[PDB]
């Protein structure tokens, strides 16, 4: 009941998924052999939301690893938690995508869907009651963005009732991870506005401050950032897996969050995050979780919420606590700094709780914000796109795959409207 099927697209997706399935596995006390070795009966009761029973007491994940150039898969196929995956769920192409949204969506991606769909359905029907899909993308490259969206449009029509999530990692403002990044960005956005129920945005930049400011790290490697992203992807489905005195399914989290069908871009954070020195001073009380999650620093995206208004928000607390302190705090903020919250929504936060904190903590939280500052990711992208599409630079690669050019402008009008939707509703 209430199963979930999970997709990992691209190099980034095939690497965030490495830590995600490592984090969730430990939380349910299963070995890299796949055998359950936990203690409580609380791990087993909702284990089938991510895994499947197998002969011998194994628990194999319900993930789908898709990628061109399986080189990066050979890493995770060799890592410590690489022995758990089904080998038939590895779908890959022998050629490369070349950081090119076109061939990752038109030529090569189109050659794998016939096989990918036999994979997704084979484990979508084993679900006695499917809850939804969830993907992990990278809006910079070609494989993650291109094949990701093409996979979505096939998913959106085959399963329109169920809900698809998206932990899309978006480009960084101050540095360019690739050169053709703005082309792959918009052409993917133009697919997400229409074919996604919810979509969180992350940035490798903000993922550095939290390790440079909050965590006070020294050598933050991607192996650590993915331990951050995996902390929110685990923080969403707690109510699905663990009981709590105020549960929150995955669906009731959208209807309380998205007023209009196109503003489905969010902004996430996590709490508590302290150094290995400060854990001696700072205490763990709901007033602490509530201020650090609300701050303009734990926002894992590089968009300052203090430039717009909060339409709605959320909070998924974890750990046996007092349901009153939570309710009075989240209330105390809205009427405290009343200039950042819209007025035609009286109470614009939802609050969840769980009897089960993380594996090694006592209290924890997770934040989801739908702010009208998310438009700032789109302006900064809408300009870098129009500076180079203006002179038709790097386009012979995209048109070389038979692409048109109105698919570029349609990707810009669709965006340059989405930047206005976030302004009528922001009366400042």
């Amino acid at each position: 009941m209430r199963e979930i099927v999970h997709i990992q697209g691209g190099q980034c997706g095939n690497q965030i998924g490495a830590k995600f399935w490592e984090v969730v596995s430990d939380e349910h006390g299963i070995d890299p052999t796949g055998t359950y070795h936990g203690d409580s009966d609380l791990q087993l009761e909702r284990i089938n939301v991510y895994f499947n029973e197998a002969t011998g007491g194994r628990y194999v994940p319900r993930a789908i690893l898709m990628d061109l150039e399986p080189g990066t898969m050979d890493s995770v196929r060799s890592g410590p938690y690489g022995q758990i995956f089904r080998p038939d769920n590895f779908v890959f192409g022998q050629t490369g995508a070349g950081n090119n949204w076109a061939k990752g969506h038109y030529t090569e991606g189109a050659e794998l869907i016939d096989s990918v769909l036999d994979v997704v359905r084979k484990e979508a029907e084993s679900c006695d009651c499917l809850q939804g899909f969830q993907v992990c993308h990278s809006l910079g490259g070609g494989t993650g963005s291109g094949m990701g969206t093409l996979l979505i449009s096939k998913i959106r029509e085959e399963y329109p009732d169920r809900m698809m999530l998206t932990f899309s990692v978006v480009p960084s403002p101050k540095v360019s991870d690739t050169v053709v990044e703005p082309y792959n960005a918009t052409l993917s956005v133009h697919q997400l506005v229409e074919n996604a129920d919810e979509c969180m945005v992350l940035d490798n930049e903000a993922l550095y401050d939290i390790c440079f400011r909050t965590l006070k790290l020294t050598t933050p490697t991607f192996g650590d950032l993915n331990h951050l992203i995996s902390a929110v992807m685990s923080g969403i489905t707690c109510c699905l897996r663990f009981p709590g005195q105020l549960n929150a399914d995955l669906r009731k989290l959208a209807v309380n969050l998205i007023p209009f069908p196109r503003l489905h871009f969010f902004m996430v954070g996590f709490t508590p995050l302290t150094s290995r020195g400060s854990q001696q001073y700072r205490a763990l009380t709901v007033p602490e979780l509530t201020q650090q999650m609300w701050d303009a620093k734990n926002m894992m995206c590089a968009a300052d919420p203090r430039h717009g208004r909060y339409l709605t928000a959320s909070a998924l607390f974890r750990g046996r606590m007092s349901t009153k302190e939570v309710d009075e705090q989240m209330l105390n903020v809205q009427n405290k700094n009343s200039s950042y919250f819209v007025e035609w929504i009286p109470n614009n936060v939802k609050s969840s709780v769980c009897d089960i904190p993380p594996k090694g903590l006592k209290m924890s939280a997770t934040f989801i914000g739908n702010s009208t500052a998310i438009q700032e990711m789109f302006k900064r992208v809408s300009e870098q796109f129009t500076a180079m599409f203006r002179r038709k630079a790097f386009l012979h690669w995209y048109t070389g795959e038979g692409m048109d050019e109105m698919e570029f402008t349609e990707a810009e009008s669709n965006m340059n409207d989405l930047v206005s939707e976030y302004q009528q509703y922001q009366d400042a």
């Binding site: 009941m1 209430r2 009966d41 009761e45 909702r46 006695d128 009651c129 809850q131 109510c239 699905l240 009981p243 005195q245 105020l246 549960n247 399914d249 669906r251 009731k252 209807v255 309380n256 969050l257 007023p259 209009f260 069908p261 709605t312 606590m321 007092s322 349901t323 009153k324 302190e325 309710d327 009075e328 209330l331 035609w344 929504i345 009286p346 109470n347 614009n348 936060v349 939802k350 609050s351």
Partner: protein, 428 residues
Amino acid sequence: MREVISIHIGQAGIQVGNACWELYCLEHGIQPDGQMPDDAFNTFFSETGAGKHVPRCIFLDLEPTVVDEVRTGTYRQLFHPEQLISGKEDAANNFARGHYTIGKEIVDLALDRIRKLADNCTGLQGFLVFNAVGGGTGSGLGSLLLERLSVDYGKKSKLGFTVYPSPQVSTAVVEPYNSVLSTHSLLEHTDVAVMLDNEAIYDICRRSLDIERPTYTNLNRLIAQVISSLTASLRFDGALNVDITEFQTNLVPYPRIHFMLSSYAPIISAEKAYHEQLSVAEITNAAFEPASMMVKCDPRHGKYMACCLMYRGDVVPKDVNASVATIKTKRTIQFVDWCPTGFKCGINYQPPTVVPGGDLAKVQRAVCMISNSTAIGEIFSRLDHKFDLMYAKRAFVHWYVGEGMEEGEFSEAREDLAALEKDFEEVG
């Protein structure tokens, strides 16, 4: 022969079901395994062919994540496994889903239980509806269920204990909407509807109980103390045994006005009893105190149409008629002119029971007041503001319209509230 049917709908429905049914099992020496080491329990239980005392209630919900806790808790040998009804997918805080899509496919099951739950019943007092307005399951299923109960029995009485959305505390954003939609369906179908807000019961736990980490499990340990006091006459000897029909006749002047308030006294910590005597005189002054209300309404802005007082313990009627007499004279309490009377009083010799691990104190005198007042228009006009503030933009509508609903159901359920508030002013 003096028996009732106790329904629990939603999460808070079964959240209070765990407090109420932990009381009656303890108030009658019923072990969690059914049996105990007549008519003292026949109000709530049914002795089988041998020894076992199963309750007569029904836990109804859509998320198994809570109804299964009852299946694994210590009260699993107690319930008939069919009473604990549950579903696969949830209402997702969306009145439409709980009414049009998912509600229609399990009511046919729930209703069969009631038919098999009423045949053993020889003389049925009335149904008992524990509901939580503000969620899809609480508002949608509850609405769809009540209409089915009206057309089956009609002559039987339905009592609605519905948690209502508070002014400040709000665990959701769209809870204004489905709280409005509930009225058009509860009003014509419930015989009488008690109200109580999660916020008002919070402050009760601050001044009186002096408990600083309140939780849903605390408040429910107060509601159970109401119904225990309310149905004491049904199962415990006492001067002026008050049934339901008697209770209902002299409280509801007009078929519309059946929205009433509640109170309780004394509510004190187990140590401040050492600083008080808590006479019949002292308690009844505190029942009419505005801070002792279980709803955030102010009775000093309105007038009383009736009151009902259920005393308990070492109480004799010579002191009831005295304390009531010194209240009609008090200036603060204003009684609407067309009732010079207004008190139906009930006495019991069975003092209120205390649960191990509870917060209240063992006392020998206790009072539960239930007043029908015209100040109730306050809490009912706040909703008329938040609904008209968000509905001006059709926010969150595309969720309701996408689940087999329409735009008329919003304006229709809106006029019914205006049609109601006039009725709370014609009585001036």
